[PDB]
Amino acid sequence: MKFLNVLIVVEDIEKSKKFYYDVLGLKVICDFGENVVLEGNISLQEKKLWLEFINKSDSEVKFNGNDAELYFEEDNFDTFVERLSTMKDIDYVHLAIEHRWGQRAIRFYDLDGHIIEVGETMSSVCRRFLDSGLSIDEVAKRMDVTVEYIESVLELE
Amino acid sequence: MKFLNVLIVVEDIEKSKKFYYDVLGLKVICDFGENVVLEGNISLQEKKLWLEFINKSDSEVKFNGNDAELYFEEDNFDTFVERLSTMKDIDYVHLAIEHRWGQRAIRFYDLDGHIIEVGETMSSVCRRFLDSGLSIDEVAKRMDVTVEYIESVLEL
């Protein structure tokens, strides 16, 4: 038992590939035509074909259920967010939020109602805290996590 | 930009943790209580809490949309499948299928309408073909892939 791929169903493979490339900078790493795999092992699957695979009528496949999300982290968070703001027809789920543990993140939909969240890298949230004057033990408490955790994220930035 | 987690929304964190553990053998690797991460970086998220996070009324969150799936591979595919058949209340999406490229796989739902697919490991599909007499070049053509690809998986 090994988890390998998250598959998302899309209406149009070429448009989604473009959306993920223009917006997230995600490129293809494997192509089967009707099923393409993006960096991170995110598989895009064409709907019509999908219907045959799982044997469900077109009515049995709903989108925008808001029941899951693809989660990403970006080193240059601000620049990404601000580039995202210059773009048109970006369907945001909500305004940019700040998680309980200090991490800024934004959430928007792809072309098919699938939620994408991209937030600051955890290691950068820590460093932000460590520079405002907090001790490492304090930071660990501030974020409801152990000092072990913080040290593993720090030596990876 | 680094993809880190697939998050799935569930009605009950403890029941899902149990479901993923009993059925797939998936254990927890990180716990925030209301948001638990399983092996593979699959994050379970409690619905009520989720509603607050993305600001949507309970009616705006639908399940069983069949618009995605979590994809797994298992070395001991048959034994897993047959263990799965002895269990009760397993919501299958469909009968066990065979993909165009030769791979057997089954699909079933978790406790919240999320689709799970677990299939044979690719390397085992390949090896199977290579033993029935096919050349490596033939296998690559049989599966619509390159010989480069097949050589990688066979060292796994």
Automatic annotation (TrEMBL), chain A:
Residues 2-121 form the VOC domain. InterPro entries: Glyas_Bleomycin-R_OHBP_Dase, Glyoxalase-like_dom, VOC_core. It holds the Pfam family Glyoxalase_2. It comes from the Bacteria. This is Enzyme, glyoxalase family.
